[PDB]
């Protein structure tokens, strides 16, 4: 989920951009607090969350993955962000308050990604 010894990870300019620029902008947002941790279905009394959502994802998981060099490329990390937003939309009603918070974070996400370096390039430590 967060770490995998058998799967290769890399550091790229786009991945570090997602960690330094995109993640830090979304993490400190006022609507970020519901998405900073995995959905605790037991504490929240949601017996159907893990049976409707087959791949849970949160900003805390994505942030730990960037800090552990989990991803090989930026497309894997942006898929996690999309998965997190899709899980909120699928599970909740389109008029729910939590959906408005996710849409606010998604627009900011798409705004920051629009200024990402165009070509992915690996960053190697010397």
């Amino acid at each position: 989920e967060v770490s995998n010894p058998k799967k290769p990870g890399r550091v790229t300019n786009q991945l570090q951009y997602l960690h330094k620029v995109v993640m830090k902008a979304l993490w400190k947002h006022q609507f970020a607090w519901p998405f900073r941790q995995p959905v605790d279905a037991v504490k929240l009394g949601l017996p159907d969350y893990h049976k409707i959502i087959k791949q849970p994802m949160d900003m805390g998981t994505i942030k730990r993955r960037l800090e552990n060099n989990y991803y090989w490329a930026a497309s894997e990390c942006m898929q996690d962000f999309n998965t997190m937003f899709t899980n909120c939309y699928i599970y909740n009603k389109p008029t729910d308050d939590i959906v408005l918070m996710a849409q606010t974070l998604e627009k900011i996400f798409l705004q920051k990604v629009a200024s990402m370096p165009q070509e992915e390039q690996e960053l190697v430590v010397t």
Partner: peptide, 15 residues
């Protein structure tokens, strides 16, 4: 701020 899930999420946050 008004939804069941969001308020339940808020109750757990204070813990």
């Amino acid at each position: 701020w008004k939804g069941y899930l969001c308020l339940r999420k808020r109750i757990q946050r204070t813990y």
